[PDB]
């Protein structure tokens, strides 16, 4: 109800619009007592269209298509969501 982002089943996803490398994104989320989204939780829901191409917890971008990559994801920047317990 007071979640300035995506509220889903007692969880609040806050968008960070600043492009960052996974490491830094993860660090920033942790620094605010939060984690990055999990590829499992968010897929096959409605959050998918908001979080696609943003950092998942595993270090890979969240994707509908887990295809078989000509670019080290560990060398790219992406926007990110930080997740916390709302209720």
């Amino acid at each position, epitope marked *: 109800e007071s979640c300035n982002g995506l509220y889903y089943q007692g969880s609040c996803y806050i968008l960070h619009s600043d*492009y*960052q*490398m*996974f*490491s830094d994104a993860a660090a920033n989320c942790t620094a605010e007592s939060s984690t990055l989204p999990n590829k499992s939780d968010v897929m096959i829901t409605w959050l998918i269209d908001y979080v696609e191409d943003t950092w998942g*917890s*595993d*270090g*890979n971008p969240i994707t509908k298509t887990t295809s078989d990559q*000509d*670019s*080290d*994801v*560990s*060398q*790219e*920047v992406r926007k990110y969501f930080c997740v916390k317990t709302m209720n």
Partner: antibody
Amino acid sequence: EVKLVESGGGLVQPGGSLKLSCATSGFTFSDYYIYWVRQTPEKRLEWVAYISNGGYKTYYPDTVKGRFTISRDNAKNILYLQMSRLKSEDTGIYYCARGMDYWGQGTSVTVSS
Amino acid sequence: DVVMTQTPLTLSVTIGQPASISCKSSQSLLYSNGKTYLNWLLQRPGQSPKRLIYLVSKLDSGVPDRFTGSGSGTDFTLKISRVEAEDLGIYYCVQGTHFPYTFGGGTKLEIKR
């Protein structure tokens, strides 16, 4: 195919300046991070500049901060490195790399008076 | 920057023999996505670096069956099972798990005869 051509490069007097070019083709320029990598006379490989995918973030190493600047052009798909205050340690063959997969052909830079 | 140590500096092996290079990182090169981003580059003189192995043990296209990559955390190995005359150049290990890309000291292969 993926193609990368370095340009510029030449003799520069210590503390001078030089602008290098990396003309790219065969891929969507903006959808890839690119490195600037140099090969010293002792033949070690060193990164001097990084521009991220989308162009959003640019990074440099501490030996090179404050005197190297990575430029870009989405129109021509060209990548630039503007280097100044050139030291003896800046001498070597300069490559732009689209990951360790694809390297340019290199452009030689000599910092000598 | 993550430190990469290659052993030895120079390699001297007869045609027809097995050869081996070592590579060691100051950190685990295990990226949180289960993958390990260690690569093996080869460079002939007057030529840009060409990648021979990626993700520890995966071979590039064209690369002969004699090249083999191993290792997991901080220790890695490139085996040339039967050295041939075309194999001469400088071999680098390069890590891609942690930003930025860092290289080894190089290993120059000299062929015995």
